[PDB]
Amino acid sequence: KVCYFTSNGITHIDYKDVDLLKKFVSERGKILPRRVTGTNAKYQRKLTAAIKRARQMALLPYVS
Amino acid sequence: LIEEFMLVANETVAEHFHWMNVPFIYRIHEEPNAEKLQKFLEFVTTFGYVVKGTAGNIHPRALQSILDAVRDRPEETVISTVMLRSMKQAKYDPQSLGHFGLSTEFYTHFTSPIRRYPDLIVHRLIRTYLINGKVDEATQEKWAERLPDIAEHTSSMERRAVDAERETDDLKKAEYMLDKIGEEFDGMISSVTNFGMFVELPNTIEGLVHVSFMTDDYYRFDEQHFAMIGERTGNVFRIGDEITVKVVDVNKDERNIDFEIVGM
Amino acid sequence: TQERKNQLINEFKTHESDTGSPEVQIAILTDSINNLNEHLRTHKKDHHSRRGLLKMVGKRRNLLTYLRNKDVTRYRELINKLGLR
Amino acid sequence: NIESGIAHIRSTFNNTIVTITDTHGNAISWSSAGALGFRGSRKSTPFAAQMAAETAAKGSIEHGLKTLEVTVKGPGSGREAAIRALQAAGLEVTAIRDVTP
Amino acid sequence: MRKYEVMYIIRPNIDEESKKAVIERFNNVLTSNGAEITGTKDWGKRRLAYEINDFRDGFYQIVNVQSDAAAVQEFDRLAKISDDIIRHIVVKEEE
RNA sequence: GAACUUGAGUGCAGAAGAGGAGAGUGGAAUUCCACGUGUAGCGGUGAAAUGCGUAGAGAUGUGGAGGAACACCAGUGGCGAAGGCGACUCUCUGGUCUGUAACUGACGCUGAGGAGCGAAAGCGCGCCGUAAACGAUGAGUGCUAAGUGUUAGGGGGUUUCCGCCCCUUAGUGCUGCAGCUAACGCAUUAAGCACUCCGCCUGGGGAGU
RNA sequence: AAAAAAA
Numbered sequence: 001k002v003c004y005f006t007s008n009g010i011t012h013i014d015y016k017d018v019d020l021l022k023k024f025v026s027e028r029g030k031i032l033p034r035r036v037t038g039t040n041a042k043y044q045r046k047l048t049a050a051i052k053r054a055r056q057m058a059l060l061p062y063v064s
Numbered sequence: 065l066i067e068e069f070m071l072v073a074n075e076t077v078a079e080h081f082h083w084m085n086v087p088f089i090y091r092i093h094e095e096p097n098a099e100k101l102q103k104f105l106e107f108v109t110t111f112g113y114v115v116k117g118t119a120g121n122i123h124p125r126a127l128q129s130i131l132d133a134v135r136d137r138p139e140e141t142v143i144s145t146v147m148l149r150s151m152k153q154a155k156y157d158p159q160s161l162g163h164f165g166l167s168t169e170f171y172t173h174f175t176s177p178i179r180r181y182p183d184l185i186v187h188r189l190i191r192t193y194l195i196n197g198k199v200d201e202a203t204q205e206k207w208a209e210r211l212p213d214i215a216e217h218t219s220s221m222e223r224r225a226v227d228a229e230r231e232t233d234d235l236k237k238a239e240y241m242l243d244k245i246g247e248e249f250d251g252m253i254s255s256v257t258n259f260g261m262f263v264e265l266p267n268t269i270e271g272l273v274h275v276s277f278m279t280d281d282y283y284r285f286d287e288q289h290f291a292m293i294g295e296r297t298g299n300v301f302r303i304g305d306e307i308t309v310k311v312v313d314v315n316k317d318e319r320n321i322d323f324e325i326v327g328m
Numbered sequence: 329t330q331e332r333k334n335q336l337i338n339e340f341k342t343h344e345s346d347t348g349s350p351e352v353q354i355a356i357l358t359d360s361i362n363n364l365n366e367h368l369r370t371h372k373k374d375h376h377s378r379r380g381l382l383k384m385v386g387k388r389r390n391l392l393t394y395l396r397n398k399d400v401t402r403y404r405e406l407i408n409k410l411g412l413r
Numbered sequence: 414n415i416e417s418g419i420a421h422i423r424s425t426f427n428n429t430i431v432t433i434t435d436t437h438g439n440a441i442s443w444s445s446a447g448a449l450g451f452r453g454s455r456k457s458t459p460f461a462a463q464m465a466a467e468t469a470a471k472g473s474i475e476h477g478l479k480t481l482e483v484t485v486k487g488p489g490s491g492r493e494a495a496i497r498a499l500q501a502a503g504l505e506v507t508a509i510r511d512v513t514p
Numbered sequence: 515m516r517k518y519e520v521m522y523i524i525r526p527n528i529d530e531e532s533k534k535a536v537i538e539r540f541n542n543v544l545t546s547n548g549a550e551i552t553g554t555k556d557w558g559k560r561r562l563a564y565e566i567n568d569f570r571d572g573f574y575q576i577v578n579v580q581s582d583a584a585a586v587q588e589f590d591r592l593a594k595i596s597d598d599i600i601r602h603i604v605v606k607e608e609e
Numbered sequence: 610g611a612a613c614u615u616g617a618g619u620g621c622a623g624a625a626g627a628g629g630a631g632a633g634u635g636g637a638a639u640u641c642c643a644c645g646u647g648u649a650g651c652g653g654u655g656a657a658a659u660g661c662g663u664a665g666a667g668a669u670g671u672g673g674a675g676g677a678a679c680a681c682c683a684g685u686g687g688c689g690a691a692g693g694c695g696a697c698u699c700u701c702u703g704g705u706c707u708g709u710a711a712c713u714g715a716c717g718c719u720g721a722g723g724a725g726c727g728a729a730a731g732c733g734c735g736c737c738g739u740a741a742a743c744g745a746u747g748a749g750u751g752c753u754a755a756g757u758g759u760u761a762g763g764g765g766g767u768u769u770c771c772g773c774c775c776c777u778u779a780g781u782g783c784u785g786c787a788g789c790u791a792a793c794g795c796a797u798u799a800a801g802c803a804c805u806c807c808g809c810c811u812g813g814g815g816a817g818u
Numbered sequence: 819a820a821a822a823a824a825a
Binding site: 364 | 618619620621628629630631689690701702703704711712713714715716717724725726727
């Protein structure tokens, strides 16, 4: 149960990197909770924003 | 590594003898039960895994697509386990009907005739047809009579080995847990029933939480979700949740491990 | 800004290093206050910022008052340069 | 003659409806558990939803559909059966989407 | 001034002749209002993960800039009115 | 008078936040009306009745009430003085914490009145101006066993990094001393031990008359 | 509970 971002040393999540973000959403495309993905709280927020800015820009779906 | 090598040799022997068109023994794995798989497909749409295909004509790869998505999820062990419980068992036969769970058309067991009678026959048919060259009609009719009765038998002798092996394992797990009554362990809800829910530990030991130990609420089983839902609390114990359990009782003769829920 | 602030420190500083002289701090506050006054002209309902304001205002006054007891001359100089009563 | 469509399934606790449309939401065909003559507890059941979807789908294949987006409504037991009745009728399911209000 | 990251989808029903015209227009808008363009990727026609104005795909442009508000806001203004740009966003970068 | 830096604050370095005020946009939704497909039920539950109906409804779209919130993320998590504040983006702005001390050199604290903020409020956005607007616990500072969790940090350790390990800071939790309590309890987020300042109480009812 | 495959 390790954080992706702490692990790989990633300090900035980018809403344009869709193929990363897709690791953290469900197949429906709901965001996955932090207790499932191992993510740090710190990153979960960042991640949460990114995905939201993605979704606005139709890079991810709101609902698959 | 050894797995894969044995597989290809077992694949290569089968294929050679199918094209030869002589009586031979194959290891077959039929298509899974369409009703059981229909219930498996439903179960995975609850977790959000959406498959492409129908229960009467699934390609094996579609099932692999699920197993790749759930990899390193909490749900893995159980969707894994629930798919399994939609699969048919593999059996031996004289006909080439293919192996579903290796997604091949030609398979036999050749690589262990010390410890499997079907392998030992594959060694005799190889010596009969290829080495000796005895592809006469009387040789073929002899084996074509005998292989249906060997195939049926040896199949049933395998299932009698497995059932027995498992029954010694489950006995010695239970023997393991007799000195662990009282101890608290983290686990994962492997199954949920009308009478309770089963919990798997990190050494694969299984134990029941009977509804009578769920003293905080009146639990109702929801068959569609696979869950125990409280009426009052609104607590929901599902297949695939991580929970901590305590060991209450262990009956070695019966092979029962009873648990109680400390927390979620 | 931090460039602007660096002007204001150089202008008012009583010697080379100094950033902790009231003159300094007051200078700084004075600007903030001015800039925050400006904000509230447009954003009349921005209550939370105003609360900020009042505090800045306050910090000023006490400093000024401290200065005005410590050494009157310095006080006088300052208030004319800035334009304070 | 339109190929792509949406299969709007409403599964209530009383009934399963299945409308099939074009992409601009014009109604190709429909069926329902009640249209097939099921009554009471039967209309709720996933079997009635299954059969509802087939009847809606076989109406659509006459107009010449192939691919279906699915939209599900309501809390009923049909949606999982009724979707696999669309796949089994023949029509491929691109994506489903729960649009419960 | 401070570094922004403009991104925008052009409608999918245009030639490369008409696309470049859009790109040139809106890069010119930014640099006309005191901006400078520091990078300009083109992601090219992706599938939109839903349907914007009855188009399923569109042409992503990604403009890094440095500018003041006015530049970005003017872009913002013009990127609404325009029928070529169907969605966009300005974003402030790692400052 | 003078001097000093530990209080307080300004620098400089670093961090997190649904703090606030604007501007715009995002997908949902809801159900109002007109309109294109639509084909009889749908809907109602003991399950029909009751309804409600081919004038095509249930159900499906384009305009649409256009007015209201942001599904997952979401956590006694975070932020704010309180009331509170959860889509995303942009503009403007407030506060907080960590680190080093470059400077300042007691510049502090509390604070009646007053001023401002401040529910459904109650009523014409204005006005209302009170609210379990009660963890029923003023504010500020110091001291006084532990154990454990979390949020934002700092240093060291090996560390590729991660890693785990440990000290330390600020906040937020659960247990638990000593002490305190009538008891229940509280317990370094004290209701313990001290000091400064403020609000308030003095049988019930009559009477918030 | 419940699959291959190995042993």
